[PDB]
Each structure stands twice: as structure tokens, then as C-alpha cells.
């Protein structure tokens, strides 16, 4: 293991030799520990509160889920216990027949994914353009510095020699340059999966990359039309910690489709930073805070570029294998058998494969599968053997499915079919409201002006206008926030890091115009392109469903809040100053 990780540890060791030691009382049981060095503590036990949002969402001040979200630990104290709970585990090795099935499925899945697209290297100017269009943190400063690009080249020359000196995953400007450069190199070799949308629904069949939250519901409604059993959506208990050495080696087969110069750099990312890794993790001690140097040959680093794609790939593979078991193609005897017949797996993949991929919606560890029947509910031998053990359910207890696509959980959401006042149907995203309000009430970090705060608030308000307008409490709170925040202030900072977010709310353009573009114009499932002229024609969930999904509708405190909301708007306005404000409350029934 050391002839791959040695150089990186050697560099950390030399750089921090002042405080470098072997802390014999380290908590690593499954990870190989190398040593520690003293550092300053990072993060907090709490989260900064967005006063603009809080002042306009008073009934949620006394709501447990909302209070819970204001917390979330990021200190070495919080970092160490979260690591213990899942990261410090070992997945047993899948059986020889399981390993063969995964291999046959991996090979076929990669050829299917690359039937039209061809892998390619990603560039310095692609990364640069991305870093620029993200902020508009000190990554823009590094990208602008030619000295950063020089280290990148030095590291790349080591990678071409099959060596690694600075690619360390984290749980002066020199170390920041080494991190952003490690991320650039991985972006260079594996970014094409994201940048050239390999997991789009059109290229992957099961995939949903680049579709967006507003489309996921319509995708599930279309899967519901496919004849078969119920729709299954099983969560995996810590997916990234369940990525085996066999998963990594199967994921690596993509290098076969690459040009020699691309294959060489991609092989370097896989072999040196995925199938081997050097990790940095903050740990508190009775004599301060230390940064530990750990390593392992398996599991997925959640921060990395290829994480979404390679998780989508392995889940598609895992679900195809579970479908084969459901159909009686794979038996218990087959999974135990090294010499299992490749023929029947190839026969099933070449005749039923694509059709079987079309029965699924897969986004990283999130899957929705509509098998040909319900034998799938009890097809658990391979899923458990592959290491993809379902969360909070006895290992051999049959999976429970849904016969209504609207009850199906996918990507922290459920989806509703709404009938508009004109009779047209919408399929909308939904989640418990407390999670939405609770998240909007969190401002990111310290040293933030009221201006930056009001703009983040405006961003959350407009995201709600576009994605969650059907939630009565959120349309009101959204209008209230947009009334309290000056009209020309541009929503700045992201509301989410979600791959399903396309941030159409990050504008000063009229939200009803934007709504019409997303839900009517650009909506492939909206045949009638007649615009909606008024927010009064933009539908809500039925009162019942709105209440079932967390609404305070019908409560006194909520009616009080709704009644006295111009007072709170005025309070926020007076504190902001003599700016230009537009009153968005008239756009509502009140
Ligand atoms: O159901 C609709 O179509 C009308 C509608 C809209 C709204 C939204 C707003 O607050 O202006 C709220 C309510 C309710 C507040 C208390 C009980 S029901 C009803
Ligand atoms: O990616 C996920 O797992 C699901 C998810 C989660 C969240 C919450 C968060 O990231 O803070 C927000 C969203 C979005 C809100 C609008 C468009 S996408 C989606
Ligand atoms: Zn490296
Ligand atoms: Zn709902």
C-alpha cells in the first residue's frame, strides 16, 4: 500500500515535522493511520440564522424540525463522532458468483453508456469557466494565478509516471492550491461524465442527470405506465462506505473506451486517489486539535468529482443484478459459484437490459425500480451480498413498494399531480415544509451583511415561487420576503448544492415569467403552451395534502401571521433602509 501513498504522507510529514508524531491513542479501526500534526479548530456546533427569513416565518420559531436545522456540528468534535458511526467499517467481500455477475453487468453497462458519447479530457478553461460562474471561494484567485496551473502540471507529470505527491482528500495558499489542483486533475480525467452528461435520461435510460427537480415527478409518472409490479425505492445505509474494491475495479472499466493520453491520466485518478487514498481529518485532544493522516483501498470519497456519476453507475448495475434475481435469472447457488455460466447473464442483458434500465430512476444512491413483478420485493441475496444493505430494515425482510408513483420517495422528495383551474395537469416536487423553512432560515457562515442576508432570503423565496408555489405557507412567505427585500437586489449565494437545482430563481426577472418558462414553455409534458397570466391561476396542493406535508394551514398562529404579515415586511424594510421595494402581497388573494 505504501509504494502508492508514501510520497503524499512524506510531503505532509516534512511540511508539518514541527508538530508531527504518532498518536498511539487514535480511534481508527478499519482505516490505516499514519500520524497527526497540530492545527486550529474549524467550524461550529450551530449554524448562523437568516434574520430576514426568521422575521417573516414567526410560526416556525417554535417548530422542532426548524430548531434542529439551526444546529448541525462541523467542529473536530462533531466530525469525529459522525466518522465513528459509519466511516470506520468494513464491508464483507461479495461472493465469487456475485463478483462475476457484477463484472458482466459492469462491462455491458459501460458499452451501453458509451454507444454515442466518447470519453474525453476536461480542460483548464472548463474548470476556470466553472469556478468563475460559481462565485458570480478563493478558488477564483487560484484559477487566475498562473503559478497554480504550474503545480497542476508538476502533479500531472507525477501521475503520468504513475506517482502522486499532493492528491489528498479532506474530510497557506500552497495547501489550498494542492487541494484545488487535486480536484482539477480529477476533473480533467473524470469530469466528462458530468460535463458530457453520461447519466442523462436519454444516454443512460435510468439516469436523471441534467433533468432537474421540476422534471423528476414526470419521469416517475412515466415509469408508472410501464407494466410490472410495484415501484420500489430502498435507501442504502451509508452508500459511500458500501463501495467495495470490486465496485471500484468495475467502475474503472471506463478507461477501456478512452484515448491513450486520457486513459493514462484516468488510470492515475482511479489507481492512486480512488483504489488508494490519503485522507485528512480533524480530531480534538486534551492538548488541542490535530489533523490525522489516514488511508484505505475502498469506499467512496463523497467530495470528489466522479462521486455522483460512479455512484449512479454502480447503483444501475446493482439494481440490474437485483432485477435478474427477481426474475429467477440469478439463484443463491449462482452467487456462491465462481464458475457460474456467463451465457444466461449476457442473454438477459442483450435482450432485456435497456428495457430493464427504462423501469428505473437512479440518482447516485437514490433509486426507484418498477420490476416486471413483485418477486423483486424478496430478491435480497445479491443486494446484501454486493454490500448494498438497505437502511433501517432487517436484512431479509421483504422490501415494501408503492402502487401509486406519488407516494414514492425519490431525491428527498415526493411528487404530486395537480389539476390547474384550466384543467391542465402539473407534476410538482414536494417534501415536508419544516425542512424547506428550516433550511431557508440558515445563512452561510459568519461576516455577512444584512444586504447579503436579504439576497439569500430572496433566493430561497424565489426557489419556492418556482418549485414549491403549491405550498400555501411558502407562496405567502415567498411574497412577504420579496416585498421586504429591495426589487433590484440580485439573489446571491446558492440555496442548494443539489445536482437537481438549475437555479432559475437566481434572477431579478419576474418570477411568474420564469414560472411560465419552466412549467409551460420548456416543459415537454405540457402540450398546451398557453401562458398563465396570474399567480391566482398557479395551483396549490389540495388543503388536505398541503396539511399532510407540513402546512400550518387552519391554525390560529398561522392566520395571525398571515393577517399581520405587512407589519413584519415593514419592520424588515425600515431596517434595510430607503431603497425601492415592490409590494408582492397584492399578487395573492388577500
Ligand atoms: O386554497 C386556496 O386556493 C386558497 C388559499 C390560499 C392561501 C395562500 C395564502 O395564505 O394567501 C391560504 C389559504 C388558507 C389559509 C388558512 C386556511 S386555508 C387558502
Ligand atoms: O439533491 C438532493 O438530494 C435533493 C435535494 C435536496 C435539497 C436540500 C439541499 O441540498 O440543501 C434541495 C433540492 C432542490 C431544491 C430545488 C431544486 S433541487 C434537492
Ligand atoms: Zn496526485
Ligand atoms: Zn407533498
From Swiss-Prot:
Assembly and interaction partners: Homodimer. Interacts with host STAT2; this interaction inhibits the phosphorylation of the latter, and, when all viral proteins are present (polyprotein), targets STAT2 for degradation. Interacts with serine protease NS3.
Domain (RdRp catalytic): residue spans on this chain: 230-380
Cytoplasmic domain ranges by topology: 1-590
Function according to Swiss-Prot or TrEMBL: Replicates the viral (+) and (-) RNA genome, and performs the capping of genomes in the cytoplasm. Besides its role in RNA genome replication, also prevents the establishment of cellular antiviral state by blocking the interferon-alpha/beta (IFN-alpha/beta) signaling pathway. Inhibits host TYK2 and STAT2 phosphorylation, thereby preventing activation of JAK-STAT signaling pathway.
Residues engaged in binding Zn(2+) 2: 414, 430, 549
Protein's membrane topology: Peripheral membrane protein
Positions bound to Zn(2+) 1: 155, 159, 164, 167
Organism: Dengue virus type 3 (strain Sri Lanka/1266/2000) (DENV-3)
Superkingdom classification of source: Viruses
PTM annotation, UniProt: Sumoylation of RNA-directed RNA polymerase NS5 increases NS5 protein stability allowing proper viral RNA replication.
Compartments, as annotated in UniProt: Host endoplasmic reticulum membrane; Host nucleus
Entire protein: shown range: 2762 to 3378 of 3390
Name of the protein in question: RNA-directed RNA polymerase NS5
Reactions this protein catalyses: a 5'-end (5'-triphosphoguanosine)-ribonucleoside in mRNA + S-adenosyl-L-methionine = a 5'-end (N(7)-methyl 5'-triphosphoguanosine)-ribonucleoside in mRNA + S-adenosyl-L-homocysteine; a 5'-end (N(7)-methyl 5'-triphosphoguanosine)-ribonucleoside in mRNA + S-adenosyl-L-methionine = a 5'-end (N(7)-methyl 5'-triphosphoguanosine)-(2'-O-methyl-ribonucleoside) in mRNA + S-adenosyl-L-homocysteine + H(+)
Amino acid at each position: 500500500n505504501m509504494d502508492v501513498i508514501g510520497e503524499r504522507i512524506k510531503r505532509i510529514k516534512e511540511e508539518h515535522n514541527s508538530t508531527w508524531h504518532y498518536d498511539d491513542e487514535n480511534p481508527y479501526k478499519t482505516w490505516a493511520y499514519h500520524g497527526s500534526y497540530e492545527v486550529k479548530a474549524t467550524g461550529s456546533a450551530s449554524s448562523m440564522i437568516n434574520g430576514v427569513v426568521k422575521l417573516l416565518t414567526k410560526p416556525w420559531d417554535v417548530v422542532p424540525m426548524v430548531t434542529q436545522m439551526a444546529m448541525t456540528d462541523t467542529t473536530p468534535f462533531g466530525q469525529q463522532r459522525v466518522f465513528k458511526e459509519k466511516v470506520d467499517t468494513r464491508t464483507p467481500r461479495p461472493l465469487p458468483g456475485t463478483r462475476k455477475v457484477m463484472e458482466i453487468t459492469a462491462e455491458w453497462l459501460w458499452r451501453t453508456l458509451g454507444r454515442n458519447k466518447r470519453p474525453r479530457l476536461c480542460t483548464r478553461e472548463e474548470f476556470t469557466k466553472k469556478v468563475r460562474t460559481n462565485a458570480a471561494d478563493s478558488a477564483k484567485a487560484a484559477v487566475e494565478d498562473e503559478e497554480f496551473w504550474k503545480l497542476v502540471d508538476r502533479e500531472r507529470e507525477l501521475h503520468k509516471l504513475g506517482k502522486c505527491g499532493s492528491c489528498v482528500y479532506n474530510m497557506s495558499r500552497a495547501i489550498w492550491y494542492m487541494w484545488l489542483g487535486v480536484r482539477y486533475l480529477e476533473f480533467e480525467a473524470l469530469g466528462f461524465l458530468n460535463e458530457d452528461h453520461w447519466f442523462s435520461r436519454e444516454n443512460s435510460y435510468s439516469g436523471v442527470e441534467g433533468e432537474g427537480l421540476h422534471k423528476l415527478g414526470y419521469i416517475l409518472r412515466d415509469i408508472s405506465k410501464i407494466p410490472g409490479g410495484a415501484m420500489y425505492a430502498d435507501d442504502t445505509a451509508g452508500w459511500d462506505t458500501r463501495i467495495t474494491e470490486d465496485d471500484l475495479h468495475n467502475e474503472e472499466k471506463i478507461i477501456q473506451q478512452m484515448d491513450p493520453e486520457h486513459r493514462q491520466l484516468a488510470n492515475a485518478i482511479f489507481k492512486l486517489t480512488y483504489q488508494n487514498k490519503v485522507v485528512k481529518v480533524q480530531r480534538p485532544t486534551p492538548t488541542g486539535t490535530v489533523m490525522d493522516i489516514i488511508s484505505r483501498k475502498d469506499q467512496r470519497g463523497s467530495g470528489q468529482v466522479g462521486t455522483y456519476g460512479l455512484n449512479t453507475f454502480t447503483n444501475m448495475e446493482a439494481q440490474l443484478v437485483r432485477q435478474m434475481e427477481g426474475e429467477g435469472v440469478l439463484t443463491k447457488a449462482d452467487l456462491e459459484n465462481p464458475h457460474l455460466l456467463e451465457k444466461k447473464i449476457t442473454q438477459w442483458l442483450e435482450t432485456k437490459g435497456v428495457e430493464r434500465l427504462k423501469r428505473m430512476a437512479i440518482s447516485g444512491d437514490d433509486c426507484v425500480v418498477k420490476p416486471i413483478d413483485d418477486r423483486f420485493a424478496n430478491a435480497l441475496l445479491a443486494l446484501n451480498d454486493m454490500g448494498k444493505v438497505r437502511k433501517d430494515i432487517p436484512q431479509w425482510q421483504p422490501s415494501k413498494g408503492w402502487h401509486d408513483w406519488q407516494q414514492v420517495p425519490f431525491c428527498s422528495h415526493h411528487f404530486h399531480e395537480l389539476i390547474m383551474k384550466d384543467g391542465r395537469k402539473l407534476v410538482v416536487p414536494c417534501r415536508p415544509q419544516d425542512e424547506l423553512i428550516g433550511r431557508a432560515r440558515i445563512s452561510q457562515g459568519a461576516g455577512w451583511s444584512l444586504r447579503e442576508t436579504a439576497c439569500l432570503g430572496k433566493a430561497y423565496a424565489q426557489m419556492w415561487s418556482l418549485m414549491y408555489f403549491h405550498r400555501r405557507d411558502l407562496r405567502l412567505a415567498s411574497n412577504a420576503i420579496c416585498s421586504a427585500v429591495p426589487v433590484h437586489w440580485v439573489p446571491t449565494s446558492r440555496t442548494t448544492w443539489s445536482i437537481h437545482a438549475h437555479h432559475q430563481w437566481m434572477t431579478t426577472e419576474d418570477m411568474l415569467t420564469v414560472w411560465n418558462r419552466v412549467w409551460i414553455e420548456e416543459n415537454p409534458w405540457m402540450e398546451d403552451k398557453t401562458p398563465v397570466t396570474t399567480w391566482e391561476n398557479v395551483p396549490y396542493l389540495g388543503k388536505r395534502e398541503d396539511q399532510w406535508c407540513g402546512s400550518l394551514i387552519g391554525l390560529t398562529s398561522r392566520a395571525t401571521w398571515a393577517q399581520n404579515i405587512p407589519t413584519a415586511i415593514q419592520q424588515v424594510r425600515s431596517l434595510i433602509g430607503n431603497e425601492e421595494f415592490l409590494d408582492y402581497m397584492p399578487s395573492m388573494k388577500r
